[PDB]
Write a structure and sequence with these properties.
about 140 residues; Centriole protein (chain A); homodimer
Chain lengths: ~140, ~140
Amino acid sequence: ATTLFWRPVPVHVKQQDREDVLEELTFRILTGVAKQNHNLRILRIHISSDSDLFFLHTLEVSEEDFQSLKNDQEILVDFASFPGKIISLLEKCILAQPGDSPRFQAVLTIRGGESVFKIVEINDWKKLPHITLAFRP
Amino acid sequence: LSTATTLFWRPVPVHVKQQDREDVLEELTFRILTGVAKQNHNLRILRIHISSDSDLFFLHTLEVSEEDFQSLKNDQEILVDFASFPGKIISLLEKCILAPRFQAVLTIRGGESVFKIVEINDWKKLPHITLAFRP
């Protein structure tokens, strides 16, 4: 395994039927091979809280899974360059300030068994979805 | 319709996605019409017509009544109102005409068609607007 990213990121957490709450969530991005298959390279992303044990959101994307994600999210680069672009988007959310425009925000809509993570760019008339991922508790 | 005003009427280079085969680049005429339907509580209506450029053509139409615009406003996470919406769309359409960073994309989704304007950046096709049209 290789930790390519490990630091807190400002995320607007949307709990079920509860208004948005800005929280500092820890993001761990790791790479390597699959546990039950060393012929398959995988990407693992961990969303956690330093003040909650039950708050764990994971996401595994293998090079096979990426081929569907590449078409779904309309990504131009390859699987190797994918974690870098995620890190870049996560960096913008960290450096983002309530005054500047356009502003990048990290959003996590949490439900039962599934949670949707989004990073949007808020311009003058719309929120532009830079990335959309699905995480499991 | 009362006080009808055609805000937009010109062909646009559109990438019409083919499924089993390579997608084709086709010029489609986009018409944006706004007006007042006094038959419906004087509520305003926004019509967008997409048609191919030939004597034999297809016609897909999108209608949004102003009280229904909040549905679209929620789906696409739009921050402006019904009146400011056409201006943003026209702006994106013109960017597609000029050369490519911005491209117009039309794909099939069941019995409907999905129009989309994307911005080619450094790693993906950033969707600036996604609309559903009905034949």
